[PDB]
Amino acid sequence: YQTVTFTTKNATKTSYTQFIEALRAQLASGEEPHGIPVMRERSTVPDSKRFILVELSNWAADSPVTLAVDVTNAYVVAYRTGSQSFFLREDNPDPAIENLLPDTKRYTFPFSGSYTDLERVAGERREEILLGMDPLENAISALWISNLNQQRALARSLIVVIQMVAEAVRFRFIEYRVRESISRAEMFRPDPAMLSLENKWSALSNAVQQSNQGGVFSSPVELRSISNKPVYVGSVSDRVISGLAIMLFICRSTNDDTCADPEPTVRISGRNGLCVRVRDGKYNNGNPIQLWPCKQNSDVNQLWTLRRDGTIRSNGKCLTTNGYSAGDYVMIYDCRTPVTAASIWQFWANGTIINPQSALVLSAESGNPRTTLTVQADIYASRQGWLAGNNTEPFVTSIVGFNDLCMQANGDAMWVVECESSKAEQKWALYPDGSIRPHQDRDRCLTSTDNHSQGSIIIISSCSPGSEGQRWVFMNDGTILNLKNGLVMDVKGSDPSLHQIIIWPATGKPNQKWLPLL
Numbered sequence: 001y002q003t004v005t006f007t008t009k010n011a012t013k014t015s016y017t018q019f020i021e022a023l024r025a026q027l028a029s030g031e032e033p034h035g036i037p038v039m040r041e042r043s044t045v046p047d048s049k050r051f052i053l054v055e056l057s058n059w060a061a062d063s064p065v066t067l068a069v070d071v072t073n074a075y076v077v078a079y080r081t082g083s084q085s086f087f088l089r090e091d092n093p094d095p096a097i098e099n100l101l102p103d104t105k106r107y108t109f110p111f112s113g114s115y116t117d118l119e120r121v122a123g124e125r126r127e128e129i130l131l132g133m134d135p136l137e138n139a140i141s142a143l144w145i146s147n148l149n150q151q152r153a154l155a156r157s158l159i160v161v162i163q164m165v166a167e168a169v170r171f172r173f174i175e176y177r178v179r180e181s182i183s184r185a186e187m188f189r190p191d192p193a194m195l196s197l198e199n200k201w202s203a204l205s206n207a208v209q210q211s212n213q214g215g216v217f218s219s220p221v222e223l224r225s226i227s228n229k230p231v232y233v234g235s236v237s238d239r240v241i242s243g244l245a246i247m248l249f250i251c252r253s254t255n256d257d258t259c260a261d262p263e264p265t266v267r268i269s270g271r272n273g274l275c276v277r278v279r280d281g282k283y284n285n286g287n288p289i290q291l292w293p294c295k296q297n298s299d300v301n302q303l304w305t306l307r308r309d310g311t312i313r314s315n316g317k318c319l320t321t322n323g324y325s326a327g328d329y330v331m332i333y334d335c336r337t338p339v340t341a342a343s344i345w346q347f348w349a350n351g352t353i354i355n356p357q358s359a360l361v362l363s364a365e366s367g368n369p370r371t372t373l374t375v376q377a378d379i380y381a382s383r384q385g386w387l388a389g390n391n392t393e394p395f396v397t398s399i400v401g402f403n404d405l406c407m408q409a410n411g412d413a414m415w416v417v418e419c420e421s422s423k424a425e426q427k428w429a430l431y432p433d434g435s436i437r438p439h440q441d442r443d444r445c446l447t448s449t450d451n452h453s454q455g456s457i458i459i460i461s462s463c464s465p466g467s468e469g470q471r472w473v474f475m476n477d478g479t480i481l482n483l484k485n486g487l488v489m490d491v492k493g494s495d496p497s498l499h500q501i502i503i504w505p506a507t508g509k510p511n512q513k514w515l516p517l518l
């Protein structure tokens with residue numbers, strides 16, 4: 001395992017994914033913190049195993065351009081063109097990078113592989129360079145020739161190449177963009193979402209790794225949408241995170257703190273987008289915990305410190321169960337100095353808040369505001385789904401699936417139709433409780449006809465049950481999972497004309513890949 005190849009020659013949406021996917025597979029160390037692949041630690045990789053060679057091809061051939069890609073961060077540190085090797089200046093000469101390609105030219109550019117440098121030398125920004133097959137086809141040709149009196153264009157070219165390989169490896173969002181370039185043969189400029197993903201790749205890894213057990217960030221990471229709207233990410237469980245394919249190595253979870261275990265104070269949103277609230281702001285012992293709209297101010301009765309001891313705290317007091325039986329209510333109570341079992345919860349990344357002593361879960365048996373919460377038998381219903389984080393408004397976007405087609409609401413039915421920007425039926429609200437709702441009808445949910453039946457057609461129905469078939473999780477897999485089922489969302493027989501998205505065991509790839517679009 002050393003050399004992955006890609007060619008432009010008759011390139012398909014499939015073969016670019018196969019290439020990206022193959023590069024992700026060797027860049028993955030077996031480790032998978034919080035469920036997302038991370039890359040190998042530098043002090044762990046011997047110089048011998050420190051590189052992948054990426055062999056790119058072209059029409060105006062005849063030997064390929066080979067990039068040296070560092071397994072540690074997916075940096076393009078050098079590239080070869082026959083006898084000649086070209087290297088990027090570096091802030092800290094690594095033993096490994098020099099000696100990487102012996103028996104070869106060795107020229108070093110006066111610039112680094114960073115974007116600030118490359119843009120500087122290129123004389124334009126990332127948002128001004130077209131991306132796509134033609135741009136890559138020209139970038140490859142220009143890196144083949146490697147004319148040192150040009151150089152402006154060498155640096156431009158590396159911007160094309162790094163974005164279309166390394167960035168795509170890291171994000172399924174940008175991988176999507178290039179697939180759409182190949183399908184429509186239409187070049188594209190990098191939109192502000194793609195630039196923010198590339199800019200915040202390091203931060204996202206840091207946030208995820210240094211998160212508590214449960215995936216809650218200590219600080220949000222600020223991303224962008226297409227159009228320049230701010231996107232705040234507060235946990236691994238945020239649906240946008242599902243497009244984060246592979247992370248930089250930062251640390252290992254619990255001159256270097258292996259990984260901090262913070263105790264963040266966050267809102268907890270769930271059922272119908274409502275918030276876990278200490279009723280009327282009162283903290284007398286035994287006072288109920290309820291559903292209530294999310295306040296976005298800083299009143300203390302909606303803020304919960306998720307402490308390491310497993311308690312969940314608002315003000316000075318602890319989130320507590322009144323008893324260990326199906327139907328018993330959850331309340332505020334004093335935290336004890338031995339710290340009792342009725343006050344310990346695991347808040348799981350999937351969105352369940354479970355009291356370990358009773359194996360019963362935080363539930364909302366009733367969809368309306370002021371409904372008293374409730375430990376219940378875990379059935380992974382949406383009713384029983386939750387999300388830590390201060391940005392509580394449902395993320396609104398397109399769900400792209402098979403053949404880069406978009407889910408579209410059609411009355412009581414959903415199925416994937418060709419993507420088209422004005423939507424509005426194609427817009428989906430990704431709720432805090434795991435449900436997918438049509439933008440223009442937020443009383444209705446993306447629901448299984450029968451969650452017990454494999455092959456059951458998924459419809460749009462009333463959210464009012466808050467059932468098993470109304471919770472969905474966007475997985476690093478790229479699948480949409482049903483917890484409880486173990487089953488995935490699926491386009492029948494990879495055939496969109498059947499108008500049926502169904503519930504099916506994990507295959508095989510393509511007809512079961514989904515991306516909540518950023």
Ligand SMILES: *[C@@H]1O[C@H](CO)[C@@H](O[C@@H]2O[C@@H](CO)[C@@H](O)[C@@H](O)[C@@H]2NC(C)=O)[C@H](O)[C@@H]1NC(C)=O
Pocket residue numbers: 218219220264265266297298303390
């Ligand atoms: C919890 O939410 C609030 C913001 O709404 C933040 O906490 C506050 O910040 C300061 C102001 O001096 C500090 O004095 C607190 O101690 C204060 N309030 C309390 C008691 O929480 C904080 O940003 C947290 N939010 C995030 C981003 O996780």
Ligand SMILES: *[C@@H]1O[C@H](CO)[C@@H](O[C@@H]2O[C@@H](CO)[C@@H](O)[C@H](O)[C@H]2NC(C)=O)[C@H](O)[C@@H]1NC(C)=O
Pocket residue numbers: 034035214347348349350351352483
């Ligand atoms: C994420 O979703 C899971 C549903 O399958 C929940 O439970 C965990 O799942 C088990 C098998 O996948 C098991 O390996 C786990 O240990 C179990 N929880 C624990 C800590 O015992 C829960 O939502 C999952 N856990 C995370 C990563 O939050």
Ligand SMILES: O[C@@H]1[C@@H](O)[C@H](O)OC[C@H]1O
Pocket residue numbers: 315
């Ligand atoms: O909630 C508390 C806040 O009011 C203040 O900043 O003191 C510490 C915090 O935990």
